Design a protein around this nucleic acid. Structure first.
Ligand SMILES: Nc1ncnc2c1ncn2[C@@H]1O[C@H](COP(=O)(O)OP(=O)(O)OP(=O)(O)O)[C@@H](O)[C@H]1O
Ligand SMILES: [Mn+2]
Ligand SMILES: [Mn+2]
Ligand SMILES: [Zn+2]
Ligand SMILES: [Zn+2]
Ligand SMILES: [Zn+2]
Lengths: 32, 263, 56, 84, 43, 56, 126, 65
RNA sequence: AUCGAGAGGG
DNA sequence: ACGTCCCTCTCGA
């Protein structure tokens, strides 16, 4: 059952950016 | 022979070397000085842009083009856009240029000075060419494009003197020295224990001589003989950048007389 | 601004570039310098006040 | 209710503040298109126009120095000194 | 008129008509240089 | 302490202040752009009228 | 360069030295008002004294436009009752990029990015 | 942010000699201050122009479109 | 626009 | 009980 949602910090656990490499981060338009 | 006599030291593609014997410092300076910024040359001035997907801004690249050296050999045959008669510019006052580049290469793809192209009437005068000193001959790296970046801009190239902007800088660095053994005492030194063995003899002290310490100072010691070395990017050859140094000066003094005898 | 010497009047001298420019030797009484310091400027809307600012 | 000159006591010289209000005052008036008395030797400016007036004590003005108790000694610009 | 991103569609879409990279799927959308030429000084 | 014993004032200025060896003690190098927006009431007097009509 | 100031070689910054490169950014949103009574972006006919004509009819201005003074960027309108968003009084640049999309609510959302370069002018900190 | 055309200090054409500097230190594998010195730069003003340049343009290109 | 909180400039 | 003067930005009901 539902509650709400939680601001997440980047490069953390439950963020995609944790998952990326130089190549990936780029097409994610995110900074290496 | 004449007056201010001279003797080359070396000569080359980009540099020239000479002692101006029997020349007045106020002259060799004022000459030096006009050589820097007061000799005319050409260089891109306006630039309109149709398509620029590059990473560098429009006016980013803008500023970059203005600094590309242009051929200027015969240049007095072009007359200052501002002082000519055509609603803005023409072929009498300006060379026009254009640059198409598209990122077809799947690698990383370069645009150069070579890649420029002239799309106006030359009227048979050596103008507007972007010098290449390059070994590879490939010019000057202006920009970089990933397979799909485009660049369409065109460049109106007018005549300017560095006094207005560096780009119309015919010159570069200008070497200047005189009186190597400070025989005229024109500069108090700076030493901890010995002045001498700490300030190194410049690479010119061998064309003048040591001073025979025992002897005194001569108070009639005057400034004469100057060690100079001039260098041009190439927009103009190096003989013309020294001689149209002299030339410009004459014209400068000249128009004194000219407006002298008007009043 | 905690004293008279730091609110003196001047003659104008309209010039270029965006910066107020003042004589090196009136630094001190303002304790001002040339590394980031702004400065104020006013202008009397009359005559008597100008006199008040000129003769005082 | 006033002082008579015969018994005046205050500074007989003119004060930085008297003057600079006086030069000021007339100068405002003059530039308000007022009758000037000294003869222009060619002065667009009214601070100077007044200042010449000042140096000919041709200024029809009385300072009215007030005292702490209330009463005032009048003093003609014709009669005040000017040194400073 | 309006562009995209992850893919960069040459889209276009006058007023009132929603917004999405319908060819891809990310409401980012830019707006392209008017063919109006502009000019900058080489200084 | 804010709207009487002190307020703000029309006709006021501001900028970076630099310093000038070629200037006089008693004058201040104000830029144009302040001088174009910094006015000053002046009356119409025969001694200047031939001036004001060239500024207008 | 007296009293902690720095006289700087103009010709050398003429070659591009200490040349900045600035960017502001403006935002706005079509702000509903309940009964699906929505805002929008337009070119209108109480309105404000800018010079809209740099717009395209869609409520905008597009890259490459050299904008100045207080020239409208965004022409939002609300139930006519003008709501556009002009340039910044102080500044004078050249449009760079702009982005449209929808909020968490799903209404239009426009952020405009205008560039400009800055130049070592007498009186700039270092 | 790419190589700038010539030198801030005396303005000498140095835009060109960039790509030629790379292989000198790489392809030929040599000393930095020997690669610049053997591209015709004895004024440490020009020398400072190359040696202290970061070519962030490359990180740029690497982006999606 | 208004009040409230926040970082810098002398 | 008030608690140095002024100034430039940026952001949430
Ligand atoms: N907190 C402050 N309150 C009041 N005035 C200040 C304050 N900080 C700076 N100032 C004013 O700024 C001037 C000096 O500050 P500043 O830091 O510029 O001095 P400085 O000596 O240049 O710095 P540096 O000390 O690094 O050389 C003075 O006129 C001073 O009154
Ligand atoms: Mn300081
Ligand atoms: Mn300071
Ligand atoms: Zn012409
Ligand atoms: Zn898409
Ligand atoms: Zn150099």
């Amino acid at each position: 059952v539902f509650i709400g949602r939680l601001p997440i910090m980047l490069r953390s656990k439950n963020c995609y950016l944790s998952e990326a490499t130089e190549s990936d981060l780029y097409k994610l338009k995110e900074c290496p | 022979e004449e007056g201010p006599q001279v003797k080359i030291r070396e000569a080359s593609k980009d540099n020239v070397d000479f002692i101006l014997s029997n020349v007045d410092l106020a002259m060799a300076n004022s000459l030096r000085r006009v050589m820097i910024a007061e000799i005319p040359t050409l260089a891109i001035d306006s630039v309109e842009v149709e398509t620029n997907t590059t990473v560098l801004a429009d006016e980013f690249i803008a500023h970059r083009l203005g600094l590309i050296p242009l051929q200027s050999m015969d240049i007095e045959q072009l007359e200052y856009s501002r002082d000519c008669f055509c609603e803005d510019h023409c072929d009498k006052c300006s060379v026009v240029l254009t640059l198409q580049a598209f990122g077809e290469s799947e690698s990383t793809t370069n645009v150069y000075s070579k890649d420029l192209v002239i799309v106006s009437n030359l009227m048979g005068r050596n103008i507007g060419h972007p010098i290449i000193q390059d070994k590879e001959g490939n010019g000057v790296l202006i920009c970089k494009l990933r397979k799909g970046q485009e660049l369409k801009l065109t460049c109106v190239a007018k005549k300017g003197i560095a006094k207005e902007h560096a780009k119309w800088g015919p010159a570069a660095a200008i070497e200047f020295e005189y009186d190597p053994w400070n025989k005229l005492k024109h500069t108090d030194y700076w030493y901890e224990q010995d002045s001498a063995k700490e300030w190194p003899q410049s690479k010119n002290c061998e064309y003048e001589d040591p001073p025979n310490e025992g002897d005194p100072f001569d108070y009639k010691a005057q400034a004469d003989t100057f060690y100079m070395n001039v260098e041009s990017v190439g927009s103009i050859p190096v003989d013309q950048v020294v001689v149209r140094g002299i030339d410009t000066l004459q014209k400068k003094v000249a128009s004194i007389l000219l407006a002298l005898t008007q009043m | 601004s905690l004293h008279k010497m730091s609110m003196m009047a001047h003659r104008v001298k309209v010039i270029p570039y965006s910066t107020f420019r003042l004589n090196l030797s009136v630094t001190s009484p303002y304790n001002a310098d040339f590394d980031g310091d702004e400065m104020n400027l006013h202008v009397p809307q009359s005559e008597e006040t100008r006199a008040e600012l000129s003769q005082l | 209710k006033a002082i008579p000159k015969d018994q005046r006591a205050t500074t007989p010289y003119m004060t930085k503040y008297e003057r600079a209000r006086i030069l000021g005052t007339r100068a405002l008036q003059i530039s308000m298109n007022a009758p000037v008395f000294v003869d222009l030797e060619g002065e667009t400016d009214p601070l100077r126009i007044a200042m010449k007036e000042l140096a000919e004590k041709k200024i029809p003005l009385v300072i009215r120095r007030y005292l702490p108790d209330g009463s005032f000694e009048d003093w003609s610009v014709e009669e005040l000194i000017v040194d400073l | 008129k309006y562009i995209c991103a992850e893919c960069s569609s040459k889209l276009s879409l006058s007023r009132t008509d929603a917004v999405r990279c319908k060819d891809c799927g990310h409401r980012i959308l830019l707006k392209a240089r008017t063919k109006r030429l502009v000019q900058f000084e080489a200084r | 302490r804010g709207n009487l014993m002190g307020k703000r004032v029309d006709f006021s200025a501001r900028t970076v202040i630099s310093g000038d060896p070629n200037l006089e003690l008693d004058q201040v190098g104000v830029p144009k752009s302040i001088a174009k927006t910094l006015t000053y009431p002046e009356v119409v007097t025969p001694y200047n009228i031939d001036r004001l009509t060239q500024l207008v | 360069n007296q009293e902690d100031s720095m006289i700087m070689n103009q010709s050398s910054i003429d070659r591009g030295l200490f040349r900045s490169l600035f960017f502001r950014s403006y935002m706005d949103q079509e702000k509903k008002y309940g009964m699906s009574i929505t805002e929008t972006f337009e070119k209108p006919q109480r309105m404000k004294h800018g010079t809209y004509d740099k717009l395209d009819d869609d409520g905008l201005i597009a890259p490459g436009v050299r904008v100045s003074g207080e020239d409208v960027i965004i022409g939002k309108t609300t139930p006519k009752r003008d709501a556009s968003t002009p340039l910044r009084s102080t500044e004078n640049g050249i449009v760079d990029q702009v982005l449209v999309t929808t909020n968490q609510d799903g209404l239009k959302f426009v952020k405009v990015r205008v560039r400009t370069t800055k130049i070592p002018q007498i009186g700039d900190k270092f | 942010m790419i190589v700038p055309v010539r030198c801030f200090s005396c303005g000498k054409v140095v835009g060109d000699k960039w790509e030629s500097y790379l292989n000198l230190l790489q392809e030929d594998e040599l000393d930095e201050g020997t690669a610049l010195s053997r591209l015709g730069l004895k004024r440490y003003c020009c020398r400072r122009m190359i040696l202290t340049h970061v070519d962030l343009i490359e990180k740029f290109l690497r982006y999606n479109p």
